Design an enzyme around this catalytic site. Structure first.
Site, PDB file in Angstrom:
ATOM      1  N   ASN A 366      25.323  36.515  29.203  1.00 31.00           N
ATOM      2  CA  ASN A 366      24.045  36.683  29.903  1.00 31.00           C
ATOM      3  C   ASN A 366      23.592  38.151  29.954  1.00 31.00           C
ATOM      4  O   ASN A 366      24.180  39.008  29.284  1.00 31.00           O
ATOM      5  CB  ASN A 366      24.149  36.067  31.307  1.00 31.00           C
ATOM      6  CG  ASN A 366      25.020  36.881  32.251  1.00 31.00           C
ATOM      7  OD1 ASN A 366      26.090  37.365  31.867  1.00 31.00           O
ATOM      8  ND2 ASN A 366      24.577  37.019  33.498  1.00 31.00           N
ATOM      9  N   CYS A 368      23.959  40.437  32.245  1.00 31.25           N
ATOM     10  CA  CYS A 368      24.999  41.334  32.773  1.00 31.25           C
ATOM     11  C   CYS A 368      26.424  41.051  32.252  1.00 31.25           C
ATOM     12  O   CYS A 368      27.396  41.631  32.742  1.00 31.25           O
ATOM     13  CB  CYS A 368      24.964  41.303  34.301  1.00 31.25           C
ATOM     14  SG  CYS A 368      23.369  41.803  34.977  1.00 31.25           S
ATOM     15  N   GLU A 370      28.660  38.617  32.388  1.00 30.28           N
ATOM     16  CA  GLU A 370      29.706  37.936  33.188  1.00 30.28           C
ATOM     17  C   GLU A 370      29.708  36.400  33.104  1.00 30.28           C
ATOM     18  O   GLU A 370      30.728  35.773  33.389  1.00 30.28           O
ATOM     19  CB  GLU A 370      29.678  38.403  34.659  1.00 30.28           C
ATOM     20  CG  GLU A 370      28.724  37.687  35.618  1.00 30.28           C
ATOM     21  CD  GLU A 370      27.279  38.125  35.493  1.00 30.28           C
ATOM     22  OE1 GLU A 370      26.898  38.676  34.443  1.00 30.28           O
ATOM     23  OE2 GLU A 370      26.513  37.912  36.454  1.00 30.28           O
TER      24      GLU A 370
END
Ligand code: D5M
Length: 674
Positions: A366, A368, A370
């Protein structure tokens, strides 16, 4: 210059050789009594206030109508019962600027901190007054912090959706690309981050159409996405894809604007086979994906590259370009030094501990880095034809505050209540015109419970971030999070009588997930860390065996449960260090109109100054060891910022990344240089 800013600036003026840390307490007090308390709206009572907010279209009517007004009054009373005070100017500033409900003209404030919590708790509990009170206590004690979209918008009428993360597969067609762009803007408007897998899109030269996109390969698609975002956007590409060099060159500082991508984040997915080909210093190849689809009837990134690599090379109907694999790894390190990009996903580290390979292997991540889940491509078509829907990914997030959870001795209670809040937000989500995402939400039911304030907690108990003591705490802490998360997921499956789609073929169902947990103990080895868990029951190998049997009987409601996000904005409101990362700066200097603001790290003082060690001075090998220890007990991923110096060479950067790979790190995020 306002008094609260002047008082905040006096922290940096020395007195008796020390920083005046207590001047921040005066600064925040001034911020309330000279500004916030002068701009809040008066109401005669709570009934008048709530009727006003419902009737003037600020709050939704339906979630409040599930309670009697007497019960609502008691929930609000619970929020105001504990005398919550912000310890810093910035914590209070960040709430009232970014989260507190304003009037439509945005001149007055309609919510205190306690009002937002009361409304969020009444939203979560769905009529259950006693559970709403637990949510209020959980949030007012700052044991749990819902993500920005949930915490901002829960209970409001004029809003986006409460889901943070969206990940989209994109099939190899103009109709698919067009639909992906439309869905991206829809989901970005709803407040979520959107990440797109581009590994199935055909490489440069394979598009035989008279359109502006055609001749640039995936860079054409990146440009369309990048322009549209002018929620934020990301794009991922497998390293064996032909356009990999052009994909990377969008983030060069010297690249001209027709190729350059400014807004969009980028990520690169790297299987072991590429690391094998880098280890032995021989030339390797990158593939034109449409030729692979023509030949095999399967997409490149769906097929097993360990097995099929040599077969793609020897097949003459598959088109290729030769590259030097070591020099591409060097280029990755160099761009990360200059730009911070791309993010790296070590695909086999993700998939060797992935619970749901039977659904699909994890192909990308995604915004970020994670969220790590199975996905399947859709096929979008025109008016008179039928769409064939696959599986996108959606995940709503929230974070434990490690400091307060440990001090309240509430690991079990907080993890299980947080899981319930995340489940209710998932149940009440209603995504239109993106049926692959709707499928994800309804069928897979994934959530992302993370954690913040690791370094802050360790630093205030005399434990250094790089020490084996810290890793010992993290090992036990996140084991416990995983235990009670799974337990609650299984409890919810029993109560609802449902499991996530294709639970039956997961490693949870076969028992394989629990192998290390039934055979090895994760209680603290150091006495100092064991004393911090005094009063909380630490789950044993025997408890894990009992949980394994409980899951085998009842299943699990959630396909995925845990991931550690960066927590950029909410960490201020929580007076918490960002995520599980080490702090960048002991004291942050930031601009405020004309003036400056100063933010010491939460809990920083002269007597613990040593323990708030700045991330740039740490050994990144030992930071890798910390996150690897946490990653054991997190089913998805962890946003791993790396903190570098300009003294480091490309050799040094490659050694850090290859060590991360060796220790089983799933992803690495933005590369930070001092
Ligand atoms: N630090 C901080 N956080 C939150 N609200 C605050 C703070 N300082 C003052 N106030 C608000 C709370 C009350 O409405 C009023 C008096 O706070 P009193 O504590 O009596 O001075 O000002």
């Amino acid at each position: 210059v306002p008094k609260w800013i002047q008082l905040n600036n006096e922290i940096m003026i020395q007195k008796d050789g020390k920083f005046q840390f207590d001047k921040d307490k005066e600064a925040v007090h001034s911020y309330f009594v000279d500004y916030i308390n002068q701009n809040t709206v008066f109401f005669h009572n709570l009934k008048e206030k709530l009727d006003y907010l419902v009737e003037n279209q600020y709050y939704e009517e339906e979630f409040l109508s599930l309670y009697s007004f007497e019960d609502i009054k008691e929930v609000f009373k619970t929020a105001y019962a504990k005398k919550f005070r912000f310890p810093s100017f910035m914590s209070a500033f960040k709430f009232y600027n970014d989260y507190a409900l304003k009037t439509n003209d945005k001149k007055k404030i309609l919510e205190r901190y306690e009002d937002r919590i009361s409304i969020v708790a009444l939203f979560f509990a769905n009529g259950d007054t006693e559970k709403a009170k637990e949510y209020v206590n959980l949030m007012i004690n700052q044991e749990y912090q819902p993500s920005t979209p949930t915490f901002l918008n829960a209970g409001r009428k004029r809003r986006g959706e409460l889901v943070s993360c969206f990940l989209l597969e994109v099939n190899d067609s103009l109709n698919d690309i067009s639909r992906a762009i439309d869905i991206s803007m829809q989901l970005s408007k709803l407040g979520g981050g959107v990440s797109l897998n581009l590994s199935k899109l055909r490489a440069k030269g394979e598009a035989i159409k008279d359109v502006e996109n055609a001749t640039k390969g995936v860079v054409g698609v990146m440009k369309l996405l990048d322009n549209a975002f002018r929620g934020s956007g990301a794009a991922y590409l497998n390293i064996f894809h032909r356009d990999i060099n052009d994909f990377l060159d969008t983030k060069k500082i010297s690249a001209d604007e027709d190729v350059r991508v400014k807004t969009l984040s980028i990520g690169v997915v790297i299987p072991d086979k590429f690391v094998e080909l880098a280890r032995e210093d021989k030339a390797a190849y990158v593939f034109y994906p449409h030729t692979i689809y023509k030949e095999y009837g399967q997409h490149m990134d769906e097929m097993d590259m360990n097995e099929m690599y040599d077969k793609f090379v020897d097949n003459p109907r598959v088109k290729k370009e030769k590259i030097n694999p070591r020099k591409l790894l060097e280029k990755l390190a160099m761009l990360r030094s200059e730009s911070g990009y791309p993010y790296i996903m070590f695909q086999d580290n993700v998939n060797k501990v992935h619970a749901n390979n039977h659904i699909s292997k994890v192909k990308f991540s995604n915004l970020c880095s994670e969220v790590l889940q199975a996905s399947q491509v859709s096929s979008y078509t025109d008016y008179d034809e039928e769409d064939e829907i696959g599986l996108d990914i959606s995940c709503n997030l929230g974070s434990l505050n490690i400091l307060n959870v440990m001090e309240h001795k509430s690991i079990e209670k907080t993890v299980k209540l947080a899981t319930d809040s995340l489940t209710h937000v998932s149940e009440t989500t209603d995504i239109r015109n993106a049926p692959a995402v709707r499928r994800a939400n309804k069928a897979m039911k994934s959530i992302g419970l993370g954690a913040m304030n690791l370094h802050g907690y360790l630093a205030q108990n005399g434990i250094a971030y790089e020490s084996p003591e810290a890793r010992d705490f993290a090992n036990t802490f996140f084991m416990m999070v995983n235990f009670y998360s799974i337990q609650r997921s299984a409890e919810i499956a029993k109560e609802k009588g449902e499991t996530f789609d294709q639970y039956e073929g997961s490693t949870y169902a076969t028992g394989e997930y629990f192998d290390k947990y039934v055979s090895t103990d994760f209680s603290p080895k150091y006495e100092k860390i064991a004393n911090l868990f005094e009063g909380m029951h630490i789950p044993t190998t025997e408890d894990w065996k009992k949980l394994k049997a409980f899951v085998a009987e009842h299943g699990m409601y959630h396909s995925y449960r845990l991931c550690i996000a960066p927590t950029g904005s909410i960490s201020y409101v929580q007076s918490s260090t960002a995520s599980v990362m080490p702090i960048m700066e002991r004291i942050e200097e930031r601009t405020y109109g004309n003036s400056k603001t100063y933010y010491p790290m939460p809990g920083l003082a002269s007597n613990n100054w040593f323990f708030y060690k700045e991330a740039y001075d740490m050994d990144m090998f030992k930071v890798v060891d910390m996150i690897a220890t946490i990653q054991q007990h997190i089913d998805q991923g962890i946003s791993f910022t790396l903190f570098l110096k300009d003294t480091m060479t490309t050799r040094d950067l490659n050694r850090i990344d290859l060590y991360a790979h060796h220790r089983g790190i799933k992803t690495i995020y933005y590369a930070r240089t001092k």
